[PDB]
Subunit: 467 residues, 2 copies
Amino acid sequence: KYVKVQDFYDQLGKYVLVAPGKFSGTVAATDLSTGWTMAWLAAWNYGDTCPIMHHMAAFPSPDPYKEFEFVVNTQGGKNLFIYGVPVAVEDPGEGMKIYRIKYDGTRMNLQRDAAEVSGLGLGVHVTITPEADGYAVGDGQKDICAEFDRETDMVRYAWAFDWDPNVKDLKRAWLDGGTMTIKRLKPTLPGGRYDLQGSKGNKIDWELVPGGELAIEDGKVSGDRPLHSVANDALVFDPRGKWAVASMRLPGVCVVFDRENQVPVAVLAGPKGTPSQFQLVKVDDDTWTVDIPEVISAGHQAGFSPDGQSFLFMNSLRQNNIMVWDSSNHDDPTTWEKKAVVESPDWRGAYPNTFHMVFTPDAKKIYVTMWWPSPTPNGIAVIDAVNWEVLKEVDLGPDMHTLAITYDGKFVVGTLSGYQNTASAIVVMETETDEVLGFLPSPMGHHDNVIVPRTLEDLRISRSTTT
Amino acid sequence: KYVKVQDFYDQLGKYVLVAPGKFSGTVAATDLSTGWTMAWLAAWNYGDTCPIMHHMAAFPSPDPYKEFEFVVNTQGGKNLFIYGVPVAVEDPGEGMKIYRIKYDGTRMNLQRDAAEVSGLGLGVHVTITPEADGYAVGDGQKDICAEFDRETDMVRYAWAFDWDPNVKDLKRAWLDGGTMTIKRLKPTLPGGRYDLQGSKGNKIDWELVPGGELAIEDGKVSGDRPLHSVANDALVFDPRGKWAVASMRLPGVCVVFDRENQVPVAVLAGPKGTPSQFQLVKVDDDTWTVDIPEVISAGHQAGFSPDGQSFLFMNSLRQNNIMVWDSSNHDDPTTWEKKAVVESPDWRGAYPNTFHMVFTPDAKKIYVTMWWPSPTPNGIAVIDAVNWEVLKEVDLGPDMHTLAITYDGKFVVGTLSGYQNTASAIVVMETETDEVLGFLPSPMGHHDNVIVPRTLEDLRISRSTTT
Ligand SMILES: [Cu+2]
Ligand SMILES: [Cu+2]
Ligand SMILES: [Cu+2]
Ligand SMILES: [Cu+2]
């Protein structure tokens, strides 16, 4: 007549949860079928002076418990001053590192820093290619994103984004529109290397915090080049191959990239009432532009349903909803048209924001995150992806972040992360009747979490297609 | 249809688990009633450049949820280089910090490094005074131990310990016997502060490891003064006041000291084939010696029964046993006589060593760890503490560390630490029928944990009386 916590985990199946801990310094693999941490890694170990450990993604493995590979980045610079911790390192390391890490069935071995190898340092999202032959990072202080080869860790293409405001005052620089340029970067050092590790190429001094467009507008984000920010956040991929979509927060657009031919081919328009798309203009071999008349809202979260037949981009703060296109046509992104929009009283005021999402395998539902600043209950809301409405919402706790799903599609498993100073959990939730089965210790402030995929098809619902 | 983990947690009651994480750099507090981490702190945030977060202890709090205080201490220097981990840090800091931290019902808040206050820095067990008006810290590098004020963090009294060996050859220097000095240690800088923060005082470059007496003997441990080493481990407290007892690892003894009178009063003799005690000789007002014919076996873990009717000391490596004294005469420690010796047929090898214990509140059972070098499964033995015999041994998995108990007596709560590169976990066993209830994620490397106690009474079974 005593309850064994093992009974809990029995129901979860043979999956491996991984997560980085932001100010914690750590990355951690957990075995849901038992409750142990398989392994963990403290990057201070490795002389890293600002081991803000940030986004990660993992390669599909035939047996994750035997071995698997992952990628996880870091932030530095004025990133350390932007949470509520009264940190003491006045002058931190710059981060912007792209670690390569293998769990080999025992432990995690630090393989290298990919930004030393390539010479390109990025510190926001990391995704895996749908072929698992590579991976991608985005970045929001230097506004560059990049697809990298898995073996060589060299950049396959990088794309810089620059904002030229119609009205040259922070106060109107986005609202009153302008023109963004899409700039094909090229190595500048010998052996195909870039010169962009670290705070090198930062337009601003931290990635924007949520509703941070208000902040930079008000002159409150230090950097050399803020009038020039577009704030890239991600680079995600088409389950079907060929395409990748770069996400730009502040001009609320997404730009569709021909990966093999390395060219941009469409710019998807975020805010409800806009067209489907803005017009891509080519200046030369390495420079396109887009004309944005005004910026009604900033965007954040972007990605594809698992069969790629639907593209999503979330409007946040000024508007709060899910903007949705028909990406059905795989041969031609310029034809992707607005298909629906998901609104709800759930999105009450400026907050909550919806920054993260995972689908079900069967592209019928999505679980999406609800973020408030403290103390407002953060939670999950569940999306009917066939009719496009909110089914329900569940309150959970402080500072919701990412979500992942078991590959059998059974349990959702997210990380709540105490605003880097308070309560942090793993949350489990069953897809069947959308009940919160409850929480597991997690003394880390996760901005990322995945479950190790086995198959290429598993990826389609992992950090590849969404963030 | 689905199992909720909250059913599991509902049975444990309202206790807070607190734990440091070693090479993790972090300390975590965990709500056993809900599964959440209440708050965590990453020392690197506070300019700690070798945050090996070691021992800790927690002050009684009327309501832990609302607020509580702890002591947690770091190690440094070549302690970095000791484990599986291919650490890469050019300039480790020295460790030896004694941090004060304060959970305010939402976050932890670093209040002070006390060794900067006192100027004495010690890196091995933390204990809480039985009156909860103070703490004590031991160290086996400097071989100092000291009690501190809670309010001032200033040293009440401090003792230092020197080996003068019979045979001046490292290999023979404990086994053929020797004389141990016990000195009053007295401060050197203005405002009665000590000149002994960080590495100053280190006679060896790291805390010996399990088996570590073979390394020291073997010339394998560096430092200025190995022949002089006694490796003080802890300064643990008589739950009934007056005494504290200083565990000495290489001389296989425990020293018993009058707290308010700062003299030693008794040397207890650890191994099988020794008297209950050896002779104290006063050399002068500040100093004392004891002659030990030969060190039959090194010892380690040591403390009292909750009613301190019993005092205990483990033989480790050369013997593996639990030596028990009749400490019932609280009047006069030199009256204390060995009464029982707990042994079992599977303690006959070098391994496993028993370094930690917890007692049930009524005193009739102990819980004790079974540590091994990988890959052999570490464990918990249950000790009948009226008959003094082994009751049950349970396999658990790698690198068992410390144990604490719920104060209602029903759940034992332990830590496994994956030798700092593999599996780590919190473990819960129930004390009714000594079944293992299972495991919780603990991505850290705990060599300590506590349940926040609520009365001076709970302290008799916490990080006060045992380690
Ligand atoms: Cu994002
Ligand atoms: Cu982040
Ligand atoms: Cu010890
Ligand atoms: Cu330790």
